């Protein structure tokens, strides 16, 4: 379970991602359920000017004008938003499922769940209990040795953060670059004259008020997501958390003989701190020696 | 079950927000389907005049008019209502959802639950496990009184939340009241798409106008209620100093005149939870006297 | 859930009729926006048809101006008014377990009723363990010490029925005074005479002969439901339910000491009794000093 | 559930397969919607030339033009993408769920899981009935699976075929992705009925189709590169043998046997998921452990 | 459940049936989604001739032409694919759901299940007793009931023969008249008084798409034919009318179990195509010395 | 469920009938989805004649022509198929659902289940106080039910009449379908008289969905013919053996316990019809039907 294995960063990131997906879906829905460009030939008691063009030559005119006079961004913005949202979504689903980094999370979560609600921790401040305590101590030592050398628990996190930050920067730049070229009334000087007669036509993209407005809203939302990502990166460069400073536990437990948590164990403890400040205490409790000997002696 | 600390105000808030969201959804659904503008040129057995304009010049006329004539409010009111309603709904839920502030409320609620159910309180109100449980509850009460009674952080967050809600309510009422007088039926569009189409001035009729305007008033009305609730809210936390309680009535009630008058976060939480069921306060304050510790020790002894 | 016994027949009939009225309102709104509304034509006063010579957008301007300033306020937005009134009635009916004191007292009473209805010791005493009887007795003291001190829940149903009756009267008045304005063929004289060309016009509001009939049906429902609330006046006005006197149980059980409760305990007891005359007998056992003394002696 | 027996050459490939299925679905949907070709007869302040052709002869013109004047790839690209994607999925599907050998894989998985948490495993690292049953299961595995070939060959072909398919897909969707254009120049002979001989056509979904085709080219390149790396891994380890050296030297047991053929292949493949079940299997397969268990049976 | 009797033939048959049903569904979806034959009257600065005929007359022309010009395979092809697919799918999956052998299938399944995880079976094969004796006696009685009568040795044979015949017929028809699914044809309808013109040229819009799904379906039919031919070859090239527990005698220790023939032979031989050792788990009940040893242990 | 109370005849019947319903449904779809008669006015390098009729006068022409020009069978075929299939399906299951005759079948099912595998049955058929109690209870229940049921004929009359009605309906369906199947053609000729309004009197109509209707009707005739053949065969097998008296002659001769007599009327019919599912429950229910079993149970009570 990752409910406790998710800092304050990755609930706001998740909510903003879901909001972006909803915005993109609505934009694409409006793009599909519309009429798009509707162009007519420029003519350079009132009475209308009878253009005298059929209902198929007008379909050809509109088709050529759309994909020869409307810029790149204005015509596919929902697709670009959807793709970038997919990138920022499945760039935060790797380290929880990447190759070789799946079993360790489950093992650590199982250990944390198992070694939490026991009488020994409360009594810190018959044969079955002692045997279970010794088995838990041996398993904890074996697991801590297991996650002690190959530490894919910061490289994955740091890499995910770096990719997220780079994507945020590029997305903001691109979005703010061309969001000035999505206009309503374009002047398509498309030259197909041997068939449809008229030379230059004017065009009026239908959905170009929701396009710019949705682009501004999406740019603001992506700005918030990028600032949150930058702050999360800053927390990753504010203090070397590759080892844990088990000073509070050692001082306020009376069992100050446990080794200091380092590498993946320290990373997991620091992350769990954002959930509840007792899981690392539980691991340290089932990470000592004198208390283990006392448990063995009380087992008999 | 963080429901004990949610007064009648936070109960009406969810319902009013749901009503506003439903109104917005219906409005957007209506604006999506029905053809919006139907504009025609003007003349600025009586036979009908023949304009002689095709079925694409008519669509261009309609598209230009329904983007250069109809005002902003009438064009996009449902979206504004949806955004404002979502913001208002989110604001109230961000008092206990503050990152890292869920712990204090959870501890207070669980400690109150453990204090309101033990038989030790009734025994003191006139074995072996009883004294141990009473002593452990007293120790937990001291620990919460040590940590959960450190600073008035929570009472400094609800005040800000209520102030923000009031400011938003004033803004929403002002904007809607000022600009809900420009959603009209027969607007006049004077657009110079004249060489292309043929005629200069025209009249337009936003089909889904007389409905939307009516809906607006409903929203305005609903908004008032929410704002009004906030008003009474900004009288529970303003007319009295809710950061220093006084459990003198309960102490005189059960006889033990030894439980002190709590202050700061403990006082705020007690005085806020009391309005839901004003009896758990006495039970909670009961496990705050040295008589309880002495009785637990003697019973254990 | 678990509230099936807090409803006399009046509540059940009201729920059924309200569901039906909501269904009718939904169907009405679907019809009101499902098909072609008012169709209007311009009055023009060997056979030969008269050629009006009006296009297919001039006609839509005519129809839209002549079906928003000619049909009366009832005929146009009728189904919406029906839906609004149905929702108002539903909220008025189901607001007995939402207010704070209502929820608290209802929770306490429901818990006590569930505990007592499955009390084997109650049946054992009624035939002529250990501290479970004492726990039940303490729970009963808690219940009829918190709940049985005032009529907090007794005014809620004392006002909700009144409000529902007033609303029923108002609805009958409105839908019966303005139900003669839904006429099929209306005459609209709108002065859109320069744009379209012809001044006066006649209109047929196609979906009228159905809708008007529907209104009658709606009134019929809002009649029967109303009368139901009327009888709910009697059970709240016939004899003072402020006290419940289980005098019959005293003779039928052999223990002439069961208390005669009053106030909100009495109200809830009488109402639950109207749902089923089986909970009172079972719950009376843990309400007498004789049973407490018998349990205390049997412990010895 | 075959979740452990899946190297890095089994996760990214599956994900890219899902992506290919999605791209094909979107393309097929788009071709289902929209209108396709819209063609008009050419002339082989200016009033437009009145073509003056009915509304059914125009449908005849468009129907002829979009059948005799649009290239094979561009006319049916989404269907081809879907078919090729399903084909490349099916081959990988039977790799670990082959028709007539799924029993062996499940048996090996069950035996490995049982051997993972043996009570004597920790004792050797530092009550005989369960150990005896596990020893019997291990003996059954050594008798049946170790003598059984024709399991590594399946995982040889289920990577050999995909490489050829990837090369062919790149080749086919390489050249014929320059003949998916916008405007064509149809010159058909329907002149006695429609009236005009040569006409110009403008396929509607062509730019988006070209973009989606380039995207599918990139994703297929990724999948093919993953397959090529997997094949190179198979061909750059000679991993049809077992050499219990690390677990033996780390435990001290001097009776660890060497597995060949199917057991060796399974060990080498699962050796990417976690290098711990191999130690448990080696411990269960050490005859000194069996002798110690027999002595302790007293 | 009954999946135990499912050789490679059953897997291939189920898969190809799914594929054929998919192709037929995708065809009959488009069979009426788009518009069928668009036909216009032939005329037997370029300027377009004006036909001058209304919309209803054009609808009548199309209706007469695309029912007097398009061949009995170009028009109702998807329905033919669907009918043939249903026949070739319900011809199989009839052994397991036919009265007259459904009880036999149930008895075979129950006998397989009962003599599979017997507590004494572990001891007997590797090296409580009353239950094993009861199961053995019940199995023996069931075998004696099913000993005489090939009520199951001919059902599968006839099903395979039927599928072979249908495969040959389908690969004859659908490959002999796949030369008429075509684009523009020449309708020579005679409706001249009403519409106005005699000879018309037509274009069946979904032509060079049906004539490709046709080759796809012909390939799928060929594949299912190959699988059915191999199954038939397995059926009538080796003597499956009598089993042989030769390996059991030389690999278990009880050299007195007889060879069950007829229905028991067919059921055992078919099961052996899925997992051989399972038969061994029942072979312990095929020796009377096993019952004697069980009685001795119970003694 | 009395699935075992159903011969092969009703195994395929309530299957083939299902198929019939399917065809009907499809037809109804192709009756409401696709179009119908598109009739045009008759005229008794050329240019086409311009009829000069609008898109509503053509609607009135088509509506009158395909209501007074297309015969009754072709106008509504599919509804007839659905109704006839419904009649056959309803008459199919009026045996085990009628009021006042479901009880006997349920009692027979319960008794057959009790006696199918009973330790006393095996003990008597091989060559505990609870065992004796169960055997005595079974013998008492069997003795009660034997007098309870086998007095009338409410178990053979129902099936005989149901088969008779099904055969009659199959005959009628074949007659009607094979009779008026030469009146579904493409080009019918509507010489209607609406000329003061439209303008032309003699017009020709071409029912759009005609050939598909003829093909589906031939299919339905074939399937109903198969069902009729099955009904006829079952009828021959039901009225030739005189199943009102069943004697376990085979069981008596292969067991030698000549104390179970021959049942009569309804019990005989129920046993003989159960004989078409599994001839193992028959001997099982026959075993606890002799004085020897009750006598042995009474002796074992001591």
mmCIF file of N, CA and C in Angstrom, chain A residues 107-108 110-112 114-115 131-147 283 286-288 292, chain D residues 117 122 125-126:
data_model
loop_
_atom_site.group_PDB
_atom_site.id
_atom_site.type_symbol
_atom_site.label_atom_id
_atom_site.label_comp_id
_atom_site.label_asym_id
_atom_site.label_seq_id
_atom_site.Cartn_x
_atom_site.Cartn_y
_atom_site.Cartn_z
ATOM 1 N N UNK A 107 8.138 -5.794 0.403
ATOM 2 C CA UNK A 107 8.776 -6.360 1.586
ATOM 3 C C UNK A 107 8.832 -5.340 2.717
ATOM 4 N N UNK A 108 9.237 -4.108 2.400
ATOM 5 C CA UNK A 108 9.321 -3.072 3.422
ATOM 6 C C UNK A 108 7.945 -2.746 3.988
ATOM 7 N N UNK A 110 5.334 -4.741 4.129
ATOM 8 C CA UNK A 110 4.914 -5.862 4.961
ATOM 9 C C UNK A 110 5.596 -5.825 6.321
ATOM 10 N N UNK A 111 6.899 -5.533 6.346
ATOM 11 C CA UNK A 111 7.614 -5.451 7.618
ATOM 12 C C UNK A 111 7.053 -4.323 8.473
ATOM 13 N N UNK A 112 6.798 -3.165 7.856
ATOM 14 C CA UNK A 112 6.268 -2.025 8.596
ATOM 15 C C UNK A 112 4.890 -2.327 9.166
ATOM 16 N N UNK A 114 3.694 -5.364 9.876
ATOM 17 C CA UNK A 114 3.769 -6.430 10.867
ATOM 18 C C UNK A 114 4.310 -5.919 12.197
ATOM 19 N N UNK A 115 5.419 -5.183 12.168
ATOM 20 C CA UNK A 115 6.101 -4.802 13.407
ATOM 21 C C UNK A 115 5.633 -3.446 13.931
ATOM 22 N N UNK A 131 9.776 -16.222 20.877
ATOM 23 C CA UNK A 131 10.182 -16.815 19.606
ATOM 24 C C UNK A 131 9.798 -15.923 18.433
ATOM 25 N N UNK A 132 8.597 -15.339 18.471
ATOM 26 C CA UNK A 132 8.184 -14.425 17.414
ATOM 27 C C UNK A 132 9.057 -13.180 17.393
ATOM 28 N N UNK A 133 9.413 -12.657 18.570
ATOM 29 C CA UNK A 133 10.285 -11.489 18.627
ATOM 30 C C UNK A 133 11.663 -11.797 18.049
ATOM 31 N N UNK A 134 12.223 -12.962 18.385
ATOM 32 C CA UNK A 134 13.530 -13.334 17.847
ATOM 33 C C UNK A 134 13.469 -13.562 16.341
ATOM 34 N N UNK A 135 12.398 -14.199 15.858
ATOM 35 C CA UNK A 135 12.236 -14.393 14.422
ATOM 36 C C UNK A 135 12.096 -13.060 13.702
ATOM 37 N N UNK A 136 11.342 -12.128 14.290
ATOM 38 C CA UNK A 136 11.216 -10.799 13.708
ATOM 39 C C UNK A 136 12.556 -10.081 13.683
ATOM 40 N N UNK A 137 13.344 -10.211 14.754
ATOM 41 C CA UNK A 137 14.662 -9.582 14.784
ATOM 42 C C UNK A 137 15.575 -10.154 13.706
ATOM 43 N N UNK A 138 15.583 -11.481 13.556
ATOM 44 C CA UNK A 138 16.416 -12.101 12.530
ATOM 45 C C UNK A 138 15.964 -11.701 11.131
ATOM 46 N N UNK A 139 14.651 -11.691 10.888
ATOM 47 C CA UNK A 139 14.144 -11.294 9.580
ATOM 48 C C UNK A 139 14.453 -9.833 9.288
ATOM 49 N N UNK A 140 14.350 -8.971 10.301
ATOM 50 C CA UNK A 140 14.656 -7.557 10.119
ATOM 51 C C UNK A 140 16.129 -7.369 9.794
ATOM 52 N N UNK A 141 17.008 -8.086 10.499
ATOM 53 C CA UNK A 141 18.433 -7.996 10.197
ATOM 54 C C UNK A 141 18.725 -8.481 8.783
ATOM 55 N N UNK A 142 18.103 -9.593 8.380
ATOM 56 C CA UNK A 142 18.311 -10.114 7.033
ATOM 57 C C UNK A 142 17.819 -9.132 5.974
ATOM 58 N N UNK A 143 16.652 -8.520 6.196
ATOM 59 C CA UNK A 143 16.115 -7.573 5.224
ATOM 60 C C UNK A 143 16.952 -6.302 5.162
ATOM 61 N N UNK A 144 17.395 -5.798 6.316
ATOM 62 C CA UNK A 144 18.237 -4.607 6.333
ATOM 63 C C UNK A 144 19.558 -4.866 5.625
ATOM 64 N N UNK A 145 20.135 -6.053 5.820
ATOM 65 C CA UNK A 145 21.304 -6.431 5.036
ATOM 66 C C UNK A 145 20.959 -6.514 3.555
ATOM 67 N N UNK A 146 19.752 -6.992 3.237
ATOM 68 C CA UNK A 146 19.339 -7.112 1.843
ATOM 69 C C UNK A 146 19.274 -5.748 1.170
ATOM 70 N N UNK A 147 18.549 -4.808 1.768
ATOM 71 C CA UNK A 147 18.563 -3.419 1.289
ATOM 72 C C UNK A 147 19.659 -2.717 2.082
ATOM 73 N N UNK A 283 10.726 0.246 13.400
ATOM 74 C CA UNK A 283 11.870 -0.455 12.824
ATOM 75 C C UNK A 283 13.083 -0.380 13.745
ATOM 76 N N UNK A 286 12.599 -2.835 16.513
ATOM 77 C CA UNK A 286 13.028 -4.142 16.021
ATOM 78 C C UNK A 286 14.289 -4.010 15.177
ATOM 79 N N UNK A 287 15.247 -3.242 15.706
ATOM 80 C CA UNK A 287 16.569 -3.118 15.108
ATOM 81 C C UNK A 287 17.673 -3.002 16.152
ATOM 82 N N UNK A 288 17.439 -3.440 17.386
ATOM 83 C CA UNK A 288 18.393 -3.290 18.474
ATOM 84 C C UNK A 288 18.990 -4.638 18.864
ATOM 85 N N UNK A 292 16.842 -7.019 22.238
ATOM 86 C CA UNK A 292 16.663 -8.381 21.745
ATOM 87 C C UNK A 292 17.094 -9.406 22.787
ATOM 88 N N UNK D 117 10.777 -20.398 1.499
ATOM 89 C CA UNK D 117 10.686 -20.158 2.935
ATOM 90 C C UNK D 117 10.754 -21.459 3.729
ATOM 91 N N UNK D 122 16.802 -21.111 6.648
ATOM 92 C CA UNK D 122 17.426 -20.205 7.606
ATOM 93 C C UNK D 122 18.433 -20.940 8.480
ATOM 94 N N UNK D 125 21.425 -21.250 6.622
ATOM 95 C CA UNK D 125 22.009 -19.917 6.546
ATOM 96 C C UNK D 125 22.663 -19.515 7.862
ATOM 97 N N UNK D 126 22.054 -19.870 8.988
ATOM 98 C CA UNK D 126 22.613 -19.542 10.294
ATOM 99 C C UNK D 126 23.825 -20.417 10.600
#
